[PDB]
Write a protein that binds this DNA or RNA. Structure first.
Ligand code: ZN
Ligand code: ZN
Lengths: 167, 170, 85, 85
DNA sequence: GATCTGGCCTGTCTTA
DNA sequence: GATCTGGCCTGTCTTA
DNA sequence: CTGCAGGGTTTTTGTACAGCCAGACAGTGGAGTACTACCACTGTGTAAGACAGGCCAGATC
DNA sequence: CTGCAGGGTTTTTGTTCCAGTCTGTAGCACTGTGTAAGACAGGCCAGATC
DNA sequence: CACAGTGCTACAGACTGGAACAAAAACCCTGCAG
């Protein structure tokens, strides 16, 4: 899988880790056969329910996973409280609960999710670092002023239109 | 031209390890908070009849190409006092704005917009801390539901979203 | 002196640290009026011997500091081993 | 990884380079001075014990105590060949 | 009982 | 003697 | 074959007429141009070891 | 004289293919921005009662 | 099923040439017409 350890885990190492063939390199580690089958099956369940909340608009792009999501989550939770209970007896991570409970509801309500993700914010932070070096003034007083301005200019459509150069 | 509906996704997230400048003053913490928004869609309704009608929808919302910075601060996420002190006015214009419809001169003509604000971009710890919850590992896990830790242990796949602003206030 | 506290001493904060002004700003702190004289005169000695090595070619740009270096360092060392020992 | 580079330098010092420049081939001699190291690394490449060691000076043989007694009088000894010996 | 050595733990220094 | 409550440490968890 | 010397060859290099368009010169009053200091203020130096003294552990007699 | 039919005309405009030559893009395996606190449970010693 | 890239690669696309075909444009023409 060509992966290297992380302190805090970025979502990129999460995308390499979540894949089935990633669960393959670990399936080889666990001596027990039925365990080896169990977590594998778990991961395929997860690949089936992930695009629902990851994809921008599942109502079109991935309909069948969406309609089967409730049943699929049921199956998932069953498998957890079945073979893994020792680690889920009295404790569940906030997100595993949130993703196994309220997803179908909010996708029904907003119409879609993941288009609303923090990603469109967050990413922007990268800019805030470079715009604090390249385009900064630089002194404490004016710095936020010209970062903010230059950022605004970066974001505008009017310019990007020009930078497409019409094919 | 007067029946528009504008849906704006706003997001606010913090950032650590930003080194202070020698500068003059005043003394300021290292961490910086970036408050932004993005226009997800703009649609239409009138004459009446049909629904609301999409016109423009951001094709790649996740791109950093469209995220519009608004409030830029040096604030530690942990101190609430200052965070609410600076973000107070901003929220005030929002909840004052939801009521009133905008009038712009565009395409030559005077037209009117309704704004629908959805803050969806906040991380769980921030949602919790602006909503007054106990973060982040407290017995009550769901921001959207009333389930405790152990209660969400036995039962999982069946839950009903309750938690909403007005309810939290009351 | 408009200088934030530091992690690690970087050379820039190291240039704004040793100047007569910075020392006269930290002169207000130490109550003993003999010591003010001491560390202050110390810093001036240092400012006198600093351009010797730090300048590109001291033979031209700072000759008089150069010719006085040994003696200057002598007053310096005598001041340390005496007062700061 | 820095072994080959050193072998380059040392083998290079005796030879003179011939470069065709301005239309005419010409012969250059190279004199290498490594001056830009931090001491920790100076101490490494030359085998000196580091960096808080009783023997402080890379260029001199004085201990901490003897450099405390007489500060301003010293003679540079340490160089490559003697260090090998 | 009580050395010696080495130990860790502290504990400061100097470069980084 | 021996509760109580807190206090700190520890202990894993859980978020960023 | 070399050396130089009358002229050949073709080709340069410019002067010769005479008319004529272009843009520079010079003015202006100042326009708004373009390039200038100046102002605080920054970024890159980032981890080990040596050495002293304690003193308790524990082997050795 | 007109009207349009259907030919004359030159002259656009492009046509098929084989050597190549330049130019822009997809293929590569792969990267950046998410970074700090508290909550809950259990044990147990301290320390105050009495 | 985040997204703007990350350089150098890959060879996709952009070019000629005569040899000749065809279609179309917009004239002139003559034809058959009130
Ligand atoms: Zn819930
Ligand atoms: Zn020395």
């Amino acid at each position: 899988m060509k992966l290297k350890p992380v302190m805090r885990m970025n979502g990129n190492y999460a995308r390499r880790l979540m894949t089935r063939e990633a669960v393959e390199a670990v399936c080889e580690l666990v001596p027990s056969e039925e365990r080896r089958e169990a977590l594998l099956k778990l991961m395929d369940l997860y690949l089936q329910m992930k695009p629902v909340w990851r994809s921008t608009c599942p109502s079109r792009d991935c309909p069948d996973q969406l309609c089967q999501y409730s049943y699929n989550s049921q199956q998932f939770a069953d498998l957890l409280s079945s073979m893994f209970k020792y680690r889920y007896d009295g404790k569940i991570t906030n997100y595993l609960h949130k993703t196994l409970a309220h997803v179908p509801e909010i996708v029904e309500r907003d119409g879609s999710i993941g288009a609303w993700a923090s990603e469109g914010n967050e990413s922007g932070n990268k800019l805030f670092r470079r715009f604090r070096k390249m385009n900064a003034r630089q002194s404490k007083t004016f710095e936020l002023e010209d970062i903010l301005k230059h950022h605004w200019l970066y974001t505008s459509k009017y310019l990007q239109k020009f930078m497409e150069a019409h094919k | 031209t007067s029946g528009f509906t504008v849906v704006v996704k706003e997001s606010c997230d913090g950032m650590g390890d930003v080194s202070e400048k020698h500068g003059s003053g005043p003394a300021v913490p290292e961490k910086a908070v970036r408050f932004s928004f993005t226009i997800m869609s703009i649609s239409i309704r009138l004459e009446g009849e049909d629904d609301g009608i999409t016109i423009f929808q951001e094709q790649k919302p996740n791109s950093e190409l469209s995220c519009r910075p608004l409030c830029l601060m040096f604030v530690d996420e942990s101190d609430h006092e200052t965070l609410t002190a600076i973000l107070g006015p901003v929220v005030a214009e929002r909840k004052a704005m939801m009521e009133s419809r905008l009038i712009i001169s565009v395409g030559g003509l005077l037209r009117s917009f309704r704004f629908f604000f959805r803050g969806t971009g906040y991380d769980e710890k921030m949602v919790r801390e602006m909503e007054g919850l106990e973060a982040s590992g407290s017995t009550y896990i769901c921001t959207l539901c009333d389930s405790t830790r152990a209660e969400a242990s036995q039962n999982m796949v069946l839950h009903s979203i309750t938690r909403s602003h007005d309810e939290n206030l009351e």
